[PDB]
Amino acid sequence: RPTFYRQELNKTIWEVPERYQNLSPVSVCAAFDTKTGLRVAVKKLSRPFQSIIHAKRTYRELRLLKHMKHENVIGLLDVFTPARSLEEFNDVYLVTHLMGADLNNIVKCQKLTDDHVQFLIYQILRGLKYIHSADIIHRDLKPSNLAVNEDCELKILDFGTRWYRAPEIMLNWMHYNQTVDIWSVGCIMAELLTGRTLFPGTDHIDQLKLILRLVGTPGAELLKKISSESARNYIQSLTQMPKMNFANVFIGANPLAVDLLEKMLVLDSDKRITAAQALAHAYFAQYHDPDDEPVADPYDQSFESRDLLIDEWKSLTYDEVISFVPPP
Ligand SMILES: O=C(NCCO)c1ccc2c(c1)C(=O)c1ccc(Nc3cc(NC(=O)c4cccs4)c(F)cc3F)cc1CC2
Ligand SMILES: CCCCCCCCO[C@@H]1O[C@H](CO)[C@@H](O)[C@H](O)[C@H]1O
């Protein structure tokens, strides 16, 4: 059992093992793991077991992180608690690789080279194939959720502000496809290529307005998957927007880029390219290796439909902390 030491950070006492030094806020903190020589990120959970909803989300997060073992997905390096028993088990800390920046801090409103864009988006997609294969969707993919290196190695965070969001999430559709994350990728890719936000809506309705201007009004196939006739009649009522030509916004882009984007930013989520399909697109020829794009082991999400007592969630979480084996 390690020896801990306490300290004030983010307006609260953090008790962590000796090995982790130089905690600096980023609630998350950067640190240096002196035992393994890694810069790491330490997340202290916000009141993990005050309520049943808190306790389940604590458990969800730990279950997800213990499962993910992929180079482009944030994985778990340690999980600890200063408590010596379940009885006094009240705090949870999760440790991961510290990447250093996010895709915002990187791009910095500048335009990236096409090669650089390929490598970044390929990594995103490679990571999404993995997580999608475990039947997990991100739901909120965006630049500040993509942690990146000085070397540009990328890892996705917080899987399972409204600029990268699929139009159906925004409209409370409720039966999401994994291609909601593909919409977000399209938004990210286009921003990397031009230096600007593709859809910088001022609010909810302006966002949907800017989308429709680019992608045009919903088609006939799409309309017949919409139940509400009032929703339908409002739509067919609007000015009839043709889909825009993807060249005009992306002038001088690799035409393979424009092709992939056309396949990603399709209103109809059923008609969007999937992560695995996108990896095999020609835009990625220089990075694509079909035998190094792995899928996940199947992930038991049977706890999601359970309604249990707070002490049950808290105990399940305690068990997973106690069974944790650091990776190699
Ligand atoms: O080094 C940095 N700042 C120093 C000041 O310049 C820095 C700046 C930005 C970023 C990181 C590091 C960085 O590497 C980083 C690392 C982890 C992180 N979030 C984070 C997220 C999670 N959990 C999750 O992502 C998931 C929960 C559920 C499924 S995934 C976690 F368990 C621990 C974490 F630390 C956010 C970030 C944010 C991006
Ligand atoms: C003005 C914006 C119109 C948005 C139309 C988005 C259509 C989203 O696509 C819909 O996604 C649903 C699940 O999310 C699927 O069940 C539907 O089959 C699919 O058509």
Ligand SMILES: CCCCCCCCO[C@@H]1O[C@H](CO)[C@@H](O)[C@H](O)[C@H]1O
């Ligand atoms: C800017 C106004 C756009 C409104 C479009 C709303 C239509 C989405 O309505 C969605 O239709 C689905 C399939 O019929 C239903 O299952 C969902 O409950 C509903 O959210």
